[PDB]
Design a protein around this ligand. Sequence first.
Ligand SMILES: Nc1ncnc2c1ncn2[C@@H]1O[C@H](COP(=O)(O)OP(=O)(O)NP(=O)(O)O)[C@@H](O)[C@H]1O
Ligand SMILES: Nc1ncnc2c1ncn2[C@@H]1O[C@H](COP(=O)(O)OP(=O)(O)NP(=O)(O)O)[C@@H](O)[C@H]1O
Ligand SMILES: *SC[C@H](NC(=O)[C@H](O)c1ccc(C(F)(F)F)cc1)C(=O)NCc1ccccn1
Ligand SMILES: *SC[C@H](NC(=O)[C@H](O)c1ccc(C(F)(F)F)cc1)C(=O)NCc1ccccn1
Ligand SMILES: [Mg+2]
Ligand SMILES: [Mg+2]
Ligand SMILES: [Mg+2]
Ligand SMILES: [Mg+2]
Lengths: 277, 277
Amino acid sequence: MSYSYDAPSDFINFSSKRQWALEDFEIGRPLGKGKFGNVYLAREKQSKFILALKVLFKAQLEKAGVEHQLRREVEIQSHLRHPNILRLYGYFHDATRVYLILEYAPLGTVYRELQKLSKFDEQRTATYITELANALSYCHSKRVIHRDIKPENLLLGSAGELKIADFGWSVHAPTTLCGTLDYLPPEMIEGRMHDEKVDLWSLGVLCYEFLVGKPPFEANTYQETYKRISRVEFTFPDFVTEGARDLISRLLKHNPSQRPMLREVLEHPWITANSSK
Amino acid sequence: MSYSYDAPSDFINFSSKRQWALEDFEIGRPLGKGKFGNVYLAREKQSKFILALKVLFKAQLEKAGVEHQLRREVEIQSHLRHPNILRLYGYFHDATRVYLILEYAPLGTVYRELQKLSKFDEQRTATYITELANALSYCHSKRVIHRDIKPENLLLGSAGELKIADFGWSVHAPTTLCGTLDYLPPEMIEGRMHDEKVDLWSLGVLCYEFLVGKPPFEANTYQETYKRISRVEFTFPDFVTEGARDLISRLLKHNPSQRPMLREVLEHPWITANSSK
Ligand SMILES: Nc1ncnc2c1ncn2[C@@H]1O[C@H](COP(=O)(O)OP(=O)(O)NP(=O)(O)O)[C@@H](O)[C@H]1O
Ligand SMILES: Nc1ncnc2c1ncn2[C@@H]1O[C@H](COP(=O)(O)OP(=O)(O)NP(=O)(O)O)[C@@H](O)[C@H]1O
Ligand SMILES: *SC[C@H](NC(=O)[C@H](O)c1ccc(C(F)(F)F)cc1)C(=O)NCc1ccccn1
Ligand SMILES: *SC[C@H](NC(=O)[C@H](O)c1ccc(C(F)(F)F)cc1)C(=O)NCc1ccccn1
Ligand SMILES: [Mg+2]
Ligand SMILES: [Mg+2]
Ligand SMILES: [Mg+2]
Ligand SMILES: [Mg+2]
């Protein structure tokens, strides 16, 4: 199995050829666990720069058949450079492990913040939505669709700003295929899971959860949650204001082509009235 | 870009580890011109084994941004071994070019055969559909979906056997993603572009085009073709027999889950009444 990715492996001087090596880092406390390894607080020794080192075990990746998914994740995320996207500085590997050198997000996940506060006020919510829409606008400039936006995948920077993480499901979506529609089924012509509008739906779900403290299609079985999503069946508690309802309802369209542009989110009158950014 | 693919580059003794080299091949006449380089008739020098060598220029692949598509195509196709799938024996590369070592299909494309004969009789049609269904059944057993089946991508071996070619749009489609449906849009839960049923629709279009000489949703604009596909709007000429109509109508279903399994195609009584296979 080849661990040669189109992603950087060069040593970086964080006080501003030689490839990364594990001995470049001091390791600190584990930050979390995954199915394939762990994430550690770490520090590059020459600069003393704090970062996160994600360690994945090759045997576990290859047994689960997810090694090409990791390769794509690293290749996509390492070429994104935006203040609301978690940086992937580079990667390296040894006989047993793959290492991802990540930006450290010191304030945790939005998931944990929702556990602590139950729900967010309108200003905190609208500020988060602006940051996310800015990040997703940049992603679309690079023809990247994230496709797995959810509170556990939103980390928090030193200023409390959002950091989109987990590009394990993302795709770069920029032809003889479409030159001829005659043999393509409707789902190949429409390409809905390859549509940037995928991420606009999750933006609506998140705006709802931030304000309400529960996601709009929540149900006690997966099948009922799918029915509610498929039928776009959701309602608002009384306290949700008219502007928030308008934004969320505009985002949660079954047909991806009916969802709004990111500019229309960034300029929505409820966003501009409550966002500090 | 990295040309280290998860695909074989080992020299093969064809008449029954050293890596391929350009000097292993006597390059004969061109077989065709592609977007990024030509395909040549060639023989491996030690064995005199006759094959096709596709030469692609790295500068052109990288300029066009299609090099990860080539990587995926090579990795997928080089691990498929079936008599009705065009073999990709291996690849190699030098400073300027990538080389694909391919099975030579001497008898051209089904697309050309259809141009020459205008339409096929029911025996040839059922035989071809049998071979395609066998090849696609094998693909799906490897969790590979082809997604670009059409007459131009069906080559003919020396006994007239179909060889499925062009895996440039295929996906290997075997999580935390589905662990939480609450944040996913309908199109991400359904995953229709990653459903093996994609290829069953194309098989129905092919069965119709083989018998009729034109595909069922043909229209002189792209928008009208899409509209007819979307509504599954098509008609049968009087000469298409009821048995063929039954099979084609079962395959051409908007809802992919309503399309039959490949075993049902192979076992359809019109197929077995007419196939020589
Ligand atoms: N750069 C980081 N900074 C701070 N905390 C992090 C960072 N990366 C991950 N974490 C935390 O560490 C835990 C482990 O994260 P992680 O395993 O990457 O989740 P994941 O995206 O599902 N990875 P995976 O196991 O491959 O599915 C998570 O719960 C995060 O909250
Ligand atoms: N193994 C083969 N045996 C015989 N003929 C072949 C073979 N591979 C390709 N050809 C023919 O040669 C022509 C050029 O090949 P092809 O690889 O399909 O070009 P292409 O589709 O533009 N490649 P690409 O650059 O990836 O888009 C086609 O019309 C094929 O029919
Ligand atoms: S092929 C017609 C074309 N559709 C796409 O480009 C579609 O999004 C897509 C994307 C990726 C793949 C791949 F993964 F490569 F297989 C396949 C298909 C198109 O013209 N889309 C626009 C459109 C608009 C309205 C209705 C239908 N199509
Ligand atoms: S995520 C829910 C899950 N759906 C799938 O597995 C779907 O086929 C799929 C496949 C691949 C992707 C990926 F490419 F990774 F994005 C995404 C989705 C599921 O629950 N499927 C069963 C189901 C339930 C209800 C309706 C339809 N299907
Ligand atoms: Mg690999
Ligand atoms: Mg991962
Ligand atoms: Mg590459
Ligand atoms: Mg190619």
